Amino acid sequence: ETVVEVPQVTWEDIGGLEDVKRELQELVQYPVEHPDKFLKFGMTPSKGVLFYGPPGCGKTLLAKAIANECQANFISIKGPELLTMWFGESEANVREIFDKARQAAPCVLFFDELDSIAKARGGDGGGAADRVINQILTEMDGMSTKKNVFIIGATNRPDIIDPAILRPGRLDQLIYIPLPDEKSRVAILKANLRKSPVAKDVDLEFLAKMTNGFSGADLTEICQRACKLAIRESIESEIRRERPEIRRDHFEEAMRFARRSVSDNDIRKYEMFAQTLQQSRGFGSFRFP
Amino acid sequence: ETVVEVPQVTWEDIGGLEDVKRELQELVQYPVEHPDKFLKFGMTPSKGVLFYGPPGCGKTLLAKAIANECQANFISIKGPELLTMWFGESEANVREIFDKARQAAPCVLFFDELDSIAKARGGDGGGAADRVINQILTEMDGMSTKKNVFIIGATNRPDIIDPAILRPGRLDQLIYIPLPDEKSRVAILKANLRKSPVAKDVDLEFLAKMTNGFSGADLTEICQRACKLAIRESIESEIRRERPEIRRDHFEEAMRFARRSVSDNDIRKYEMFAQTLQQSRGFGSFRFP
Amino acid sequence: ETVVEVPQVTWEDIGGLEDVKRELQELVQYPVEHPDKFLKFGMTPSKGVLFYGPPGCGKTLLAKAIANECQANFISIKGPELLTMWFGESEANVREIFDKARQAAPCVLFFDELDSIAKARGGDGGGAADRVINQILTEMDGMSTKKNVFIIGATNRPDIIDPAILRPGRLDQLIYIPLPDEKSRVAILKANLRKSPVAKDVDLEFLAKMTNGFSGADLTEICQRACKLAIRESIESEIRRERPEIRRDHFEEAMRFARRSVSDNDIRKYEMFAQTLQQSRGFGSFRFP
Amino acid sequence: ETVVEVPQVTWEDIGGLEDVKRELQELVQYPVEHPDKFLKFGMTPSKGVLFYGPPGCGKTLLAKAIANECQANFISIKGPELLTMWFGESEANVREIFDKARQAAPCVLFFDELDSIAKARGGDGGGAADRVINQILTEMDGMSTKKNVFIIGATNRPDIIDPAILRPGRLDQLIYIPLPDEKSRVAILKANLRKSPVAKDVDLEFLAKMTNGFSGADLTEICQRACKLAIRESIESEIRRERPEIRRDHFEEAMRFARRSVSDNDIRKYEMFAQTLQQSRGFGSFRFP
Amino acid sequence: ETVVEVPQVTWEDIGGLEDVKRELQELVQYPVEHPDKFLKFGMTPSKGVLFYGPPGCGKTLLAKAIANECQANFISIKGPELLTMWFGESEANVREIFDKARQAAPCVLFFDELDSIAKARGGDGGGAADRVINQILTEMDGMSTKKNVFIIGATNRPDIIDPAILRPGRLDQLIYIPLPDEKSRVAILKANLRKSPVAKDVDLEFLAKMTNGFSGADLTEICQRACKLAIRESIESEIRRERPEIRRDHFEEAMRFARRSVSDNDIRKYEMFAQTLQQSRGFGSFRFP
Amino acid sequence: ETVVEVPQVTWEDIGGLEDVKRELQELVQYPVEHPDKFLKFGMTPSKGVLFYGPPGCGKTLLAKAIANECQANFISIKGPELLTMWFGESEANVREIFDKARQAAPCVLFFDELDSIAKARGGDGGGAADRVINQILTEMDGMSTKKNVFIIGATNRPDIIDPAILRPGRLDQLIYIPLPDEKSRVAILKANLRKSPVAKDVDLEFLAKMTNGFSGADLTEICQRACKLAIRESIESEIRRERPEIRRDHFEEAMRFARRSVSDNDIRKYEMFAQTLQQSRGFGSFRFP
Ligand SMILES: Nc1ncnc2c1ncn2[C@@H]1O[C@H](COP(=O)(O)OP(=O)(O)O)[C@@H](O)[C@H]1O
Ligand SMILES: Nc1ncnc2c1ncn2[C@@H]1O[C@H](COP(=O)(O)OP(=O)(O)O)[C@@H](O)[C@H]1O
Ligand SMILES: Nc1ncnc2c1ncn2[C@@H]1O[C@H](COP(=O)(O)OP(=O)(O)O)[C@@H](O)[C@H]1O
Ligand SMILES: Nc1ncnc2c1ncn2[C@@H]1O[C@H](COP(=O)(O)OP(=O)(O)O)[C@@H](O)[C@H]1O
Ligand SMILES: Nc1ncnc2c1ncn2[C@@H]1O[C@H](COP(=O)(O)OP(=O)(O)O)[C@@H](O)[C@H]1O
Ligand SMILES: Nc1ncnc2c1ncn2[C@@H]1O[C@H](COP(=O)(O)OP(=O)(O)O)[C@@H](O)[C@H]1O
Ligand SMILES: CCSc1ccccc1NC(=O)C[C@@H](C)N1Cc2ccccc2C1=O
Ligand SMILES: CCSc1ccccc1NC(=O)C[C@@H](C)N1Cc2ccccc2C1=O
Ligand SMILES: CCSc1ccccc1NC(=O)C[C@@H](C)N1Cc2ccccc2C1=O
Ligand SMILES: CCSc1ccccc1NC(=O)C[C@@H](C)N1Cc2ccccc2C1=O
Ligand SMILES: CCSc1ccccc1NC(=O)C[C@@H](C)N1Cc2ccccc2C1=O
Ligand SMILES: CCSc1ccccc1NC(=O)C[C@@H](C)N1Cc2ccccc2C1=O
């Protein structure tokens, strides 16, 4: 059944994304800490956020990190659960999920892969409205701002999402999670090697330089392959008999199996989407007399 | 469950739309106040209306304002509820809604996003008749004019709505809610700032001049962004420690993130629809001997 | 529930259509009055009729007028009732309707908008047979001619109607209800003003001359708009305070909002249908030696 | 419910079709009368027949006449009943129909409009097998030849009919019912006037000459129109007051409204089908030494 | 209900197909008679077969003949039974059929028209797997080779049958049942005339010569037509009154109504299929040193 | 019901595929034997594998061999069972299968023909997600790494499987099972002849040389055909009466009926798939300073 706890991952685990960290802090921490200011200015705190970007870039990690920092319970609803709700034609369970989230406030309700249903039906003879997202947004409208329940959605295909969600009262802001850069990749590599002992001759900077287009999942996979090679070598040596830490050789061997999950076309499309939004922004020249 | 009350908004809240205000008054207030004249002329009061226009222009606000002025209960039926009835194949709940509206007369029954079902199926292998609008118009026909129940519909896509609703006995009139003009935008900005204190140096007229194509929702969003910026600045200042009213700088900053929800093509299409209806009117030359 | 009564309308209410009046009389009155002649000649009385023509021309009025003249109960089955029988997949209620009609003989069963189901499915992957018309014609075949139950159908789209109905045993004839002419328009205007007092200076002939392509519903709407304008003016004058009959000014104002419901293309198509039937008639030259 | 009785019609009622009369006699009469010959030759009597031709030519009349001649019960299953069984998804009732036919042997089971289901599906995404014809042919296979139950099918579209029925064990032969010829038309007109007294000056031969392409239904309709005109004239004369047999004038008037149900293209297609079968026959030259 | 017995037909009834007779003997007789050899060589006996060819060539007859020769029960399953199991969505009855076959071992289970479901779907939006053939495969895999249950399938369209059936463990071999040749046609005619007495003057060889492309069903139909003509002539002679064996003249007359069930294109396609398989065989040159 | 046992087949039974054997050993045997190393390095053992290649190359044999070597229970789920779960809309039985696998750890769960559902729907109006694979991967995510349950999947069409399975947490690695080479073919032939006695003069090398493109199933079929020919010859000799080991003649005869299941186009496509993955690998040059 559902698991409700305080995620262990902290801010240090996530490398880079300083602006997104600051913005998420502003959105989540401030309303609970200082409601007096919001009352004074009569502004209604934002209800939720929507992360969109290429897969394996740090969305679920960001949600867990903010939940841990706020010290609030975290409820995760993966895509297969949504698809099970759709196929079984039993959409009445969303009410139960929302009630469970309400019971354990403060909380952050994370709807992973919010686009799964849209993809499953083509990405489709019908329109853009399905029988699960309808219930989700109905319950979202029906909730009370008195409770500190924060809804976060994550997708890697922000062009088939039902537009009704992005209305001002349900999920206003859109945050873009880009591919890591050189400094970001160095930070990612540093973060992931805190658990696996590594020889000191390894140069993380050089490794980060050579992997230009890479998602975080790819760097994690590289680390796992290096660890697996080391384990295999150690076990073979133990088997040798009569008849401990990763070195550079294992990383060199592992890099041959590295691959780029996201093709250049997908990144180009994502930057096109971001540029479209930033162009629709407009109003670069403005000032009172 | 459903909420039945007297909406709080009033006429002074809504900016502009003087002609629509007068026409709605004529449609709603007059029948109840002076039934003697209608009896003398033997006229049957109009049963409902249908607002059509681009999203975020002030339809729900107009319905609430007229309900408040008439001092009558207001029942809102949003689009997600209609879609829930369609998906669940349980269209027999419309009878319950109409019974509830009848029980609390005088009342105005507001059907928001009356075209949602049509969009959900493409906008579609079948025809223009669905299984929910059928029940709605059946109940509408089966009602008694003795009661003071007024049906108001809204929609931002008045070209896929089922033509059967627009028959003389169900929803005769069609009102057009255009985008605000310069004076309308100034009034809108004045109305929305009655809650958030603002520095006197702000020039609302200049701000309204520079936003040519804008819906009311966009101006509200601009105000909200300015308020959020002010709250963030105050929070940062308080956090600074040792180691109250919005100014012009916050509006200048917020304007950079402003956006136009409705594209030019949509406004062109709506103007084309209005001009098509007006051309269909015709008969500009008429005078008895 | 259903309403079974004697319609209050009368032949005078309907303007024009003298030929159709005479033919409907010949079809309905003669069978009941003088069954002896039919027995002598061994001819079976015709069972039903099918009106077809542009909307708002006087079909329901014709049915009600004939029912009133025969002094027989009138049962109306609107289009939405058929559509809800189709959507709910409960077509067994047609037996109940026919039994109710049989119980209260003599009666005329009026199936309004008999083509609604065909339109609802496109006008369509399948063929021309649905699950409601099937039951209707089964019951129609299964009834006894000794009873005086008369089935009258109406439709404004006599090209998607299932051909099985038009077989000799079910619905023999096809009457055409054309748009009113100048004399017909004058009569229509005279009929509708029997209840609204009107100043003597109004010239109905001139008004009828200037409305070339119109339907009865449009003329009724013109009258309603004039009455609404008069009521508004009277109420405003009463409101003036310190601080009864229609005139030509009100009609002049109302005519600006007049419109033609049916486009020229539809009239052309209907005329082509009628001419196709009259060409299929043929046999102009014929005489025995 | 179902009606099981001996049809009243006789051979004299049907005009023409001598060859088909002889064939039907040879098919049904001989098996029951002289089973000894069939036993001696060890031949299995043919089980059923299939009538195919343009509508309204005398298929049901042929079935009724042969049933009356054999003095056997006649069970009729119209098209609407088959369509009702298809729509309701309850095809298990065919077993009951066949059992009822068995209980009343000798009998002829007449499946009117055997192609209705195929037409209702388009004439269609699926194949040529439906859920009712399957049960019909299953029961046909499961019947005992000892009983004298004769299955006769009719249809006016012998190209969408499921080919499985025409296999040797189910429905062997395919009789063709053509449009009446001049002598056939004269006989048809003579047959239908046995009930309506007619002035002796009427020349049936001349009337039949001038109707080149006509079906029996059209001639019956002409007679009915003449009778209706005479009835109307007599009713008017009786109404005259102070203030018996059809003459030629009534036929002259009725001829104006005559029509041809079957177009030339349909007759061309039917003749094409018959000639295709005849060409497939072949083997015109054959003789032993 | 189902019938389980030992078919009466024997080898001498079927004409020609000597090679197929020998191969079926090798497939069926040898496993039961001499299991010792199979145990010694450690080879698993083949489980089933699949006949494919144009309709009416002697597939069912071959199955019945092998069943009779082996003196084992024969369970037949026609296409309509499979189709009704598909339409009713009750595929769980296949388990009962297989259990019944197991109960009466040794037996041969004959699935007639194994492609009926595929044809009924078009020959189709979906793939090549249906809901009944799946159950057949499951039961076939779940069977025990200890029992002597032999599965034989037939089909006259071996290009839409689900490819999963032809896997090594389910139905390995395929046999082609060609159209009879001249000698085969002579044998077929001889076999079918063992019942109807025939005058010695008839020359079967000449009749077989003149029918180049015919199927067995056509020859049976020719014999039946000749017998029917003889019966009709005898009946007429007996009816004549005052006021035994088929001759050549009856065959001469019956030949006129003979027809070819299978068109040349179908035989060309079947020959193409056989040639494709034989080309895929290959390996005509092979020998060890 | 399901059968759970230790498969009999061993490594010796399978010919060739040395690299695949070593990799499967590394994946399965190592985690259970030396968990201390994995704990020390903090690496999480891989959960499953996914074989892909042309049919009949030895995927099931590899799974059974690894299960036997690890001495762990083996549970097989064939394609027909998955299709049965899909058609019946009863996908809740996957929980039962996974529970059964958990109960008997250590075990290897083998989902044979994992793509069957995708093929059955075209390979399709909808997307890439079905109602059974969803439950499978949900349960796979919900499993505990503490138990030694190893999910192995097989599929001979790795271009339509749902991409969600190939995510890092569900089924990480993809292994290619290519067509046997000359040495592999010789080994395959040697393995399959351990049960059927064969004359010493047979030259397996020469036989393997002449079959360039052949799957293992084809070689097994050749052996089976040779055995069948030998059995038939022995049976005939025994039948001869008055009135033991396979030789080269039987193989020479059997070669005539040999065939190639996989066309060259399929091998080309599979090679292109492998080359695409190996190109996506990239990173041929890498070395720290
Ligand atoms: N910024 C990051 N810092 C460290 N690890 C990261 C980062 N982004 C992604 N990862 C790696 O990716 C994995 C989680 O991916 P996730 O963010 O859930 O993908 P998605 O956003 O598609 O859900 C973790 O195992 C983590 O190691
Ligand atoms: N004429 C107006 N005056 C003031 N505010 C307006 C006006 N029109 C729209 N708004 C703003 O729009 C919001 C309501 O939008 P609404 O009218 O419900 O959109 P829609 O018409 O699409 O339902 C309010 O928060 C309000 O601030
Ligand atoms: N011949 C007519 N005379 C008077 N009024 C008419 C006539 N035809 C239509 N009307 C007007 O039309 C209305 C009824 O229309 P109806 O005949 O029901 O349209 P439809 O035939 O499409 O159902 C009435 O209110 C009536 O005033
Ligand atoms: N050969 C005929 N002789 C007399 N009347 C005929 C003949 N053929 C058709 N009719 C007329 O047609 C009507 C019945 O038509 P029917 O045979 O049922 O058409 P269908 O064969 O399409 O069912 C009868 O009223 C009958 O008067
Ligand atoms: N080789 C044959 N010898 C004798 N009769 C045959 C032969 N082939 C077909 N027939 C005739 O065909 C009929 C059976 O046809 P069948 O083989 O069942 O067709 P299908 O193969 O389509 O099932 C029998 O009545 C039989 O007289
Ligand atoms: N490497 C191999 N060595 C020996 N036999 C093999 C080999 N590969 C396939 N086979 C043969 O193929 C059959 C099993 O095929 P299988 O591996 O189940 O095909 P698939 O992988 O399509 O399921 C066995 O009977 C076996 O004799
Ligand atoms: C926002 C990135 S969308 C995307 C991302 C990864 C993988 C696939 C997709 N979608 C597509 O490829 C469909 C095609 C038609 N795109 C292209 C595109 C560029 C900019 C804007 C909108 C669209 C759109 O609808
Ligand atoms: C009445 C505005 S309709 C509209 C408005 C916003 C967003 C979308 C839409 N519809 C469409 O874009 C579909 C296309 C085909 N339009 C265009 C159009 C102009 C005038 C009249 C009728 C139509 C119509 O059916
Ligand atoms: C009998 C008028 S039918 C009609 C009337 C109003 C509004 C629409 C329609 N139908 C159509 O427009 C569809 C088009 C394809 N028409 C045209 C037409 C002329 C004559 C005969 C038959 C057809 C037909 O099927
Ligand atoms: C046996 C005539 S069936 C028919 C009868 C009346 C009205 C319509 C129809 N069918 C059609 O018009 C469909 C078209 C495609 N036809 C024409 C045709 C001629 C000869 C052979 C077969 C076909 C066939 O399938
Ligand atoms: C094996 C004979 S299949 C057949 C037999 C009778 C009646 C109809 C059919 N099928 C078809 O006509 C469909 C068309 C597309 N054919 C032709 C063909 C020749 C060779 C190989 C395969 C195919 C195939 O799929
Ligand atoms: C991975 C080979 S999949 C395959 C194997 C055997 C038999 C058939 C198939 N699929 C197909 O033939 C469909 C066609 C459209 N292919 C070709 C192809 C080559 C490489 C990559 C992807 C594709 C793809 O989608």
Side-chain angles (χ1 to χ4, degrees), chain D residues 79-268:
Chain D
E81 181 166 356
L82 283 186
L83 274 165
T84 288
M85 268 158 28
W86 186 56
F87 281 122
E89 302 209 312
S90 74
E91 77 265 10
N93 294 359
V94 178
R95 174 172 213 133
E96 181 56 340
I97 287 176
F98 269 92
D99 213 348
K100 191 191 308 311
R102 167 189 259 281
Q103 254 159 30
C107 167
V108 316
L109 195 61
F110 185 88
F111 281 107
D112 206 347
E113 301 156 50
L114 193 56
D115 75 334
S116 55
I117 277 163
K119 268 192 296 188
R121 284 175 29 212
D124 59 343
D130 55 56
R131 64 159 58 224
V132 185
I133 298 302
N134 191 40
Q135 214 67 44
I136 283 168
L137 54 102
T138 286
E139 294 288 348
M140 218 184 305
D141 275 339
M143 202 176 23
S144 302
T145 306
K146 155 182 201 173
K147 280 285 182 178
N148 295 316
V149 169
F150 198 64
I151 311 301
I152 287 169
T155 178
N156 36 283
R157 189 82 189 283
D159 55 15
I160 79 194
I161 212 158
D162 185 57
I165 298 189
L166 300 173
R167 263 201 257 281
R170 292 154 188 165
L171 286 180
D172 322 67
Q173 296 134 108
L174 278 78
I175 313 297
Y176 179 48
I177 305 289
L179 251 53
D181 294 349
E182 180 152 20
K183 295 284 162 308
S184 313
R185 285 193 295 277
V186 163
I188 288 159
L189 272 197
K190 294 262 192 185
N192 275 279
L193 268 44
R194 275 181 315 160
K195 54 93 181 183
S196 277
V198 159
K200 305 332 293 167
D201 203 294
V202 173
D203 286 13
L204 297 179
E205 309 90 299
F206 168 71
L207 204 146
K209 188 211 197 58
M210 220 55 77
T211 49
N212 274 337
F214 264 60
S215 55
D218 306 36
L219 280 67
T220 298
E221 149 171 340
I222 279 157
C223 176
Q224 304 259 302
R225 288 214 76 92
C227 299
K228 181 165 101 86
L229 261 289
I231 280 185
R232 191 184 78 195
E233 197 277 350
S234 179
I235 276 283
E236 184 275 356
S237 295
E238 294 303 322
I239 284 296
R240 154 52 61 170
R241 208 65 243 168
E242 291 189 349
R243 53 132 173 89
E245 52 193 342
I246 311 319
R247 315 102 50 72
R248 286 193 297 180
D249 281 41
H250 297 295
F251 268 93
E252 309 203 56
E253 161 85 10
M255 277 303 323
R256 273 162 150 170
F257 304 170
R259 64 181 291 94
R260 294 179 51 184
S261 178
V262 297
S263 72
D264 157 76
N265 287 336
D266 295 334
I267 307 145
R268 155 178 72 86

Side-chain angles (χ1 to χ4, degrees), chain E residues 6-282:
Chain E
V6 180
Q8 310 285 127
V9 303
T10 71
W11 277 132
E12 57 210 290
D13 184 6
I14 312 190
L17 308 179
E18 45 264 43
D19 315 63
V20 182
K21 290 181 178 184
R22 189 285 326 279
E23 178 189 316
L24 272 177
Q25 281 194 12
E26 180 213 284
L27 253 169
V28 168
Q29 266 176 245
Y30 294 171
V32 314
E33 291 305 289
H34 314 81
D36 47 350
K37 299 290 181 180
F38 287 82
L39 294 176
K40 199 165 93 204
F41 286 88
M43 185 207 153
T44 63
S46 308
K47 214 187 285 284
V49 200
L50 180 68
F51 299 118
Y52 75 87
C57 307
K59 296 180 276 291
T60 61
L61 282 183
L62 252 70
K64 291 184 179 181
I66 182 57
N68 168 289
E69 192 279 341
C70 205
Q71 284 290 6
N73 304 305
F74 177 86
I75 303 179
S76 184
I77 301 204
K78 323 284 289 302
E81 183 164 356
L82 284 186
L83 261 168
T84 180
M85 288 197 318
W86 185 55
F87 281 127
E89 302 209 318
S90 68
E91 73 251 19
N93 295 346
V94 177
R95 153 178 280 290
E96 181 46 3
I97 288 171
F98 270 87
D99 223 334
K100 192 190 309 310
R102 156 188 269 280
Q103 200 85 50
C107 175
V108 306
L109 194 62
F110 181 88
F111 282 104
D112 211 330
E113 309 165 42
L114 196 54
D115 80 313
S116 55
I117 284 175
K119 270 193 297 192
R121 289 194 330 164
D124 59 342
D130 54 56
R131 61 161 57 224
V132 188
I133 300 304
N134 192 39
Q135 215 67 38
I136 288 170
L137 308 195
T138 291
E139 293 295 341
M140 203 170 326
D141 282 341
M143 218 162 37
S144 301
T145 206
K146 152 177 184 129
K147 281 285 184 177
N148 304 287
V149 170
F150 196 60
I151 311 302
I152 288 171
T155 179
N156 50 268
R157 187 82 187 285
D159 60 3
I160 41 177
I161 187 190
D162 186 56
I165 274 160
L166 301 170
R167 272 196 224 271
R170 291 156 186 166
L171 286 181
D172 46 56
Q173 280 140 296
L174 294 92
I175 287 134
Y176 177 51
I177 307 292
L179 251 60
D181 294 348
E182 181 182 290
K183 189 77 76 204
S184 314
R185 285 193 296 277
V186 165
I188 287 167
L189 283 179
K190 294 260 192 185
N192 272 276
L193 297 194
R194 280 185 305 160
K195 166 35 82 172
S196 273
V198 178
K200 184 192 75 93
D201 206 287
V202 172
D203 284 7
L204 299 179
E205 44 269 47
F206 171 73
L207 199 143
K209 176 190 176 83
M210 213 60 70
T211 50
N212 164 7
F214 261 17
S215 52
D218 313 90
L219 280 65
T220 297
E221 143 171 336
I222 279 157
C223 176
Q224 284 210 7
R225 289 215 76 93
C227 305
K228 181 168 300 326
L229 263 287
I231 298 194
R232 191 186 78 193
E233 195 268 13
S234 181
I235 277 283
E236 182 274 356
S237 294
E238 294 301 322
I239 278 293
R240 171 63 200 215
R241 209 59 248 179
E242 288 187 350
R243 167 262 291 149
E245 53 193 342
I246 287 89
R247 316 100 52 73
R248 287 192 296 179
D249 306 8
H250 298 285
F251 273 95
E252 309 200 51
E253 225 181 81
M255 271 312 325
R256 298 328 186 96
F257 304 160
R259 57 179 299 94
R260 291 181 59 177
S261 176
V262 297
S263 72
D264 169 274
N265 291 336
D266 298 343
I267 311 145
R268 155 177 72 80
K269 294 159 168 173
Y270 285 118
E271 164 183 356
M272 174 176 303
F273 200 86
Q275 287 178 336
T276 299
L277 257 65
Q278 273 324 290
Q279 149 171 111
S280 170
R281 294 290 140 151

Side-chain angles (χ1 to χ4, degrees), chain A residues 26 41 127 134 280-281 283-284, chain B residues 84 120 196 232 235 256 258-259:
Chain A
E26 146 177 325
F41 285 86
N134 193 38
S280 170
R281 250 63 187 163
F283 303 119
Chain B
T84 283
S196 271
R232 187 188 82 192
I235 277 282
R256 299 306 178 123
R259 54 182 296 91

Side-chain angles (χ1 to χ4, degrees), chain A:
Chain A
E1 70 299 358
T2 60
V3 68
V4 184
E5 61 174 347
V6 182
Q8 303 263 290
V9 307
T10 72
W11 275 135
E12 181 85 341
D13 194 337
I14 313 192
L17 311 179
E18 312 312 281
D19 298 35
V20 174
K21 287 178 178 188
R22 193 281 320 292
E23 177 171 284
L24 272 179
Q25 280 193 12
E26 146 177 325
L27 275 188
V28 167
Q29 232 187 24
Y30 287 12
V32 314
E33 294 305 317
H34 317 78
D36 46 350
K37 299 290 183 181
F38 286 85
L39 295 176
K40 222 216 298 191
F41 285 86
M43 184 208 163
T44 51
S46 318
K47 203 165 283 175
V49 188
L50 180 67
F51 299 125
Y52 74 87
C57 260
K59 298 181 278 294
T60 59
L61 230 50
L62 266 160
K64 291 182 180 181
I66 181 56
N68 175 295
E69 189 277 343
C70 205
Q71 212 73 239
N73 308 305
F74 176 89
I75 303 180
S76 183
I77 303 297
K78 316 278 275 176
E81 180 164 357
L82 249 64
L83 275 164
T84 292
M85 249 163 270
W86 188 55
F87 282 122
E89 271 178 359
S90 69
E91 73 253 12
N93 291 15
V94 176
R95 144 191 291 281
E96 180 47 1
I97 280 157
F98 268 88
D99 195 331
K100 192 190 309 309
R102 153 181 271 265
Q103 204 89 44
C107 181
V108 314
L109 193 63
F110 186 87
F111 280 108
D112 210 333
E113 308 165 49
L114 201 48
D115 75 336
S116 57
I117 279 163
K119 271 191 295 188
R121 55 188 274 178
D124 58 344
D130 53 68
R131 61 159 57 226
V132 189
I133 298 304
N134 193 38
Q135 214 67 226
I136 282 169
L137 54 103
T138 284
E139 290 288 327
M140 182 180 335
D141 276 340
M143 98 191 316
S144 303
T145 306
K146 176 179 171 151
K147 283 285 184 177
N148 325 289
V149 174
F150 195 63
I151 308 191
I152 288 169
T155 75
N156 40 299
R157 189 83 189 284
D159 61 4
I160 62 193
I161 286 316
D162 184 57
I165 295 191
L166 304 181
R167 238 163 269 188
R170 293 155 186 166
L171 287 179
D172 47 32
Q173 297 149 100
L174 257 69
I175 307 185
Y176 180 50
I177 306 291
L179 266 280
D181 296 349
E182 278 72 39
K183 290 301 151 285
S184 311
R185 285 197 293 280
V186 164
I188 299 206
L189 273 200
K190 295 262 191 186
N192 282 102
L193 298 180
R194 273 143 80 222
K195 54 92 181 183
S196 271
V198 185
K200 313 322 299 167
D201 262 8
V202 173
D203 284 12
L204 299 179
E205 308 90 306
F206 171 66
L207 204 146
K209 174 172 201 93
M210 282 302 127
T211 38
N212 266 112
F214 262 63
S215 46
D218 314 285
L219 280 68
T220 298
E221 146 171 354
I222 278 160
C223 172
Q224 303 304 70
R225 281 203 71 89
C227 291
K228 150 175 317 184
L229 263 288
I231 270 178
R232 188 186 82 194
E233 197 272 1
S234 173
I235 272 183
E236 182 272 1
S237 295
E238 294 305 322
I239 284 286
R240 165 81 287 185
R241 209 65 242 168
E242 291 189 348
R243 54 131 171 91
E245 53 193 342
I246 284 79
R247 317 97 51 73
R248 291 190 298 177
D249 268 28
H250 298 293
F251 266 90
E252 282 164 311
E253 165 81 10
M255 280 288 327
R256 298 327 186 98
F257 294 61
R259 81 191 310 267
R260 296 178 50 184
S261 176
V262 296
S263 72
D264 158 77
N265 287 336
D266 297 340
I267 308 144
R268 144 177 82 79
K269 295 163 173 174
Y270 284 119
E271 315 296 64
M272 183 183 294
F273 198 84
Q275 183 293 340
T276 300
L277 257 67
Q278 222 49 33
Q279 183 188 9
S280 170
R281 250 63 187 163
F283 303 119
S285 54
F286 192 91
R287 63 161 201 190
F288 294 103

Side-chain angles (χ1 to χ4, degrees), chain C residues 16-70:
Chain C
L17 307 179
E18 50 268 51
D19 169 308
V20 178
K21 292 181 175 185
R22 194 283 330 281
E23 194 216 274
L24 267 185
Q25 280 192 12
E26 194 256 306
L27 267 187
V28 164
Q29 214 177 300
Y30 293 179
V32 304
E33 294 308 317
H34 314 80
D36 49 337
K37 299 290 181 179
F38 286 81
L39 295 176
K40 222 217 296 186
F41 288 90
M43 192 214 157
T44 55
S46 303
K47 185 40 59 198
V49 191
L50 180 67
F51 299 123
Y52 75 88
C57 266
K59 296 182 278 293
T60 63
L61 268 178
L62 255 286
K64 289 185 183 181
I66 181 56
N68 170 289
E69 191 277 341
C70 206

